[PDB]
Amino acid sequence: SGFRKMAFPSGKVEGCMVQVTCGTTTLNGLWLDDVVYCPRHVICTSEDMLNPNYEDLLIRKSNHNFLVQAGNVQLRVIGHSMQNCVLKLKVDTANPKTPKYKFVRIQPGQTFSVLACYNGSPSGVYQCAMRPNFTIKGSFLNGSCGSVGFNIDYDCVSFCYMHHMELPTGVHAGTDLEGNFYGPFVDRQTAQAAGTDTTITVNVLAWLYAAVINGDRWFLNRFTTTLNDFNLVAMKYNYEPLTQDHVDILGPLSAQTGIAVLDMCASLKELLQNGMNGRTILGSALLEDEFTPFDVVRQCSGVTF
Amino acid sequence: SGFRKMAFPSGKVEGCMVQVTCGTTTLNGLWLDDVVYCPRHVICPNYEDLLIRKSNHNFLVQAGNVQLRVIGHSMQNCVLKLKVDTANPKTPKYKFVRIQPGQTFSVLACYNGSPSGVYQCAMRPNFTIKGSFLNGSCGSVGFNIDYDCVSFCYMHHMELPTGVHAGTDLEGNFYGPFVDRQTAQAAGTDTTITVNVLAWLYAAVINGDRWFLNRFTTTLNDFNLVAMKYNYEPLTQDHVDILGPLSAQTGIAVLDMCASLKELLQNGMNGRTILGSALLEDEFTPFDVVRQCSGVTF
Ligand SMILES: CNC(=O)c1ccc2c(NC(=O)Cc3cccc(Cl)c3)cncc2c1
Numbered sequence A: 001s002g003f004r005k006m007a008f009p010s011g012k013v014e015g016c017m018v019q020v021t022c023g024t025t026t027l028n029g030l031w032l033d034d035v036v037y038c039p040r041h042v043i044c045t046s047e048d049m050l051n052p053n054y055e056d057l058l059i060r061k062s063n064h065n066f067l068v069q070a071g072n073v074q075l076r077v078i079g080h081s082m083q084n085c086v087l088k089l090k091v092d093t094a095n096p097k098t099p100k101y102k103f104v105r106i107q108p109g110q111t112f113s114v115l116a117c118y119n120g121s122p123s124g125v126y127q128c129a130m131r132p133n134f135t136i137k138g139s140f141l142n143g144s145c146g147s148v149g150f151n152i153d154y155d156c157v158s159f160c161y162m163h164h165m166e167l168p169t170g171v172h173a174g175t176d177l178e179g180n181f182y183g184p185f186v187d188r189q190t191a192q193a194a195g196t197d198t199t200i201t202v203n204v205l206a207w208l209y210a211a212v213i214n215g216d217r218w219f220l221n222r223f224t225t226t227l228n229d230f231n232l233v234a235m236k237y238n239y240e241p242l243t244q245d246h247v248d249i250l251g252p253l254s255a256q257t258g259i260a261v262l263d264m265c266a267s268l269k270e271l272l273q274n275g276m277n278g279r280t281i282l283g284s285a286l287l288e289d290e291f292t293p294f295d296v297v298r299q300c301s302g303v304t305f
Numbered sequence B: 001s002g003f004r005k006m007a008f009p010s011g012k013v014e015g016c017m018v019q020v021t022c023g024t025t026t027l028n029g030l031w032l033d034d035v036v037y038c039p040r041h042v043i044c045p046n047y048e049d050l051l052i053r054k055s056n057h058n059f060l061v062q063a064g065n066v067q068l069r070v071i072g073h074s075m076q077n078c079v080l081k082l083k084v085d086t087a088n089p090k091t092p093k094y095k096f097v098r099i100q101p102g103q104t105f106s107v108l109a110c111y112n113g114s115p116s117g118v119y120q121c122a123m124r125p126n127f128t129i130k131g132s133f134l135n136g137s138c139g140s141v142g143f144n145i146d147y148d149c150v151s152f153c154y155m156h157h158m159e160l161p162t163g164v165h166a167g168t169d170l171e172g173n174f175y176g177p178f179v180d181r182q183t184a185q186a187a188g189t190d191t192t193i194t195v196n197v198l199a200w201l202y203a204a205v206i207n208g209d210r211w212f213l214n215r216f217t218t219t220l221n222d223f224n225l226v227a228m229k230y231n232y233e234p235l236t237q238d239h240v241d242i243l244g245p246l247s248a249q250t251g252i253a254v255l256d257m258c259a260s261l262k263e264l265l266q267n268g269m270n271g272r273t274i275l276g277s278a279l280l281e282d283e284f285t286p287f288d289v290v291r292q293c294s295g296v297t298f
């Protein structure tokens, strides 16, 4: 019993964190095999950020301009290349602590663990989700750039995010491990703002199924809804449209609890209309959207209370 | 910016988790040097009588894909200490520490010696922890990190009828009035950790959330008279002293922040949130707030 926001054990990722210095800038790198991956803005000054020509700044750099530090050991850089918004530093030593890994690009709604680092040293781990507006509501300070997001399924680390910047509203933006940004963001100091954010509906529903599995059913009702009628009400509360794919994905949770997806949709409609009336669901007074249907199956028991 | 419930990196602890089997029971062990620590209920009650009938080979210890050979065994309170033939090469710098209610820690939840997740939680005033555990999680550990030293503070033993969790320190002494057997045991009435709610209000002010601030102050006595009515733990002068650095950074005196909490307790949030929460959060200590808003690394 119990339902917590749970992160993956960070050990396999801690063994890959290094410190990258270029001139006066210092941020984090991910050392996998003989390559260190880090945000390409490490080659920039604060001035360059207004309109940076990265190709021009990079052509003026040599290998010895990049200082890479793994614990108390200096790594020798033997090559460098740029792939989209990530700088790839070829080093002389392969990381002996390199785990089994894949680079994966996630979709909004997907969750992941973040290992927040400063100066190549990991300071904490937390769970978060890729928001519908492609931002992440993380907890980051200056020097955290290059911190990574990941999932560990079986013995393989799936790297999905690298931290690049903080937006004016305090939310964060970054890239996949191939340097492609999530969202309409650029590694440029420009007037770019996060779009209006929405609630991840399929995740709220999964979290309601988790509450039913943990013995709480106060929010259920005798009503059902059409998928179209649910979406007309959901849009009014800034909820993401629920698609037929989302309904299909919720199938196993519906089977385990005996509550059809459109029947659970009718409870969500009522929760949006009435609020919680002094009650909580899984110790929360708000509707939680940072647990996927897969996270619920992973964490919760296979037998309903 | 951003405020998350953050756990310590679990790497130093993952390298210590092993699987312990005794007959038909399977749970987790903590392998430090040549000793494996695990709940004594793995032998399940007169524990000395059940233990005297056991031999070393009755305990199967598995570290990854390698079998460890048990060469001795002894009991210390509610923890079983299995002397093994191999010292753990991944043993970090560590201490065994007993925490106080209100203090927080990271939990590395394990099943069959394999770590599955990490989360942050607090020792409640009623000595229970609101964790997330399933069958096979016994022996999962709680910890903090100070520089490079892992401070082990909790070992999971059982789940109570309300879904909350109970366990011991690493010397086998339970937190709370609990015993390790199948009997009628209930968690006492819980209270809100007041010093932690205040720290979380200071964290909100640091992150630019000040709607709950007012021009008023309160005496420590008047605050405690109101706090006792809402099932809040009494705020002591020590708690006020501990909140000193957060008061200095924000310019808001502790008894001034207490007047804001008094207003939230009497009138609610009125459709508003603090750090994305519609409830007052008590599982962040004053030190956790300072650490998350400073960038302390391990
Ligand atoms: C209290 N928080 C802060 O003051 C703060 C300051 C800075 C933070 C930060 N840094 C940047 O954004 C660097 C940069 C500037 C312009 C463009 C790009 Cl692509 C990168 C990252 N993550 C978090 C931060 C947090």
Ligand SMILES: CNC(=O)c1ccc2c(NC(=O)Cc3cccc(Cl)c3)cncc2c1
Binding pocket: A001, A301, B041, B133, B134, B135, B136, B137, B138, B157, B158, B159, B160, B165, B179, B180, B181, B182, B183
């Ligand atoms: C789906 N999970 C469960 O049903 C479940 C079952 C059991 C859980 C558990 N184990 C126990 O309490 C076993 C025990 C019984 C009597 C005395 C003692 Cl000291 C220990 C711990 N933590 C979580 C659990 C969760």
Ligand SMILES: [Cl-]
Binding pocket: A105, A106, A107, A110
């Ligand atoms: Cl995805």
